[PDB]
């Protein structure tokens, strides 16, 4: 690896002669809020972003436009898993910063939450989420 995450001085201090620049961070989504809330200096420097989704960002990176991409964990892992050859993310076990999870958003205090949540717990309990992982999210590398 070349960068130790969000604590490296290269990211934390954008004043290098060789300025490793333009992590994707598609604007006006979710991780941009975290960046703009915690440390404003990247958000100030970070302007050479991508105007499209990961699909354009990955080809731009392969073409040499930018050398770093900062985005979600699951989608980036899937993209890396489904590729000719392989494009490697940083150390995967430690590449999950600001851990959270997906979920279903409903109206404030609705009675469905009592049942659908327990259904989801059951689903994770019997292993029926597991073979969905095999079927839908897999790659060669």
């Amino acid at each position: 690896d070349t960068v130790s995450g969000l604590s490296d001085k290269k990211f934390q201090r954008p004043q290098d002669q060789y300025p490793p620049f333009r992590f994707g961070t598609v604007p006006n989504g979710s991780t941009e809020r975290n960046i703009r809330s915690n440390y404003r200096d990247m958000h100030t420097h970070m302007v050479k972003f991508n105007q499209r989704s990961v699909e354009d960002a990955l080809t731009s990176l392969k073409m040499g436009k930018l050398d770093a991409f900062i985005y979600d964990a699951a989608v980036l892992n899937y993209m890396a898993g489904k590729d000719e050859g392989c494009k490697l993310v940083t150390i995967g076990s430690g590449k999950v910063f600001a851990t959270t999870g997906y979920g279903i958003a409903m109206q404030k205090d609705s009675h469905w939450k009592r049942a659908i949540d327990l259904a989801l717990l059951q689903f994770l309990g019997d292993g029926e989420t597991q073979k969905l992982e095999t079927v839908w999210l897999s790659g060669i590398c």
Binding site: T99, G101, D117, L118, L121, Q122, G125
Partner: protein, 35 residues
Amino acid sequence: ADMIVAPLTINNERAQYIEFSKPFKYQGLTILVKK
């Protein structure tokens, strides 16, 4: 007791009688072998 602050596992059997909170650490299940 009025609260449980401990490594409590969230599952179906407990959610029927308890209102939990969002997880603060994810974990799974492994096995221990002497080596």
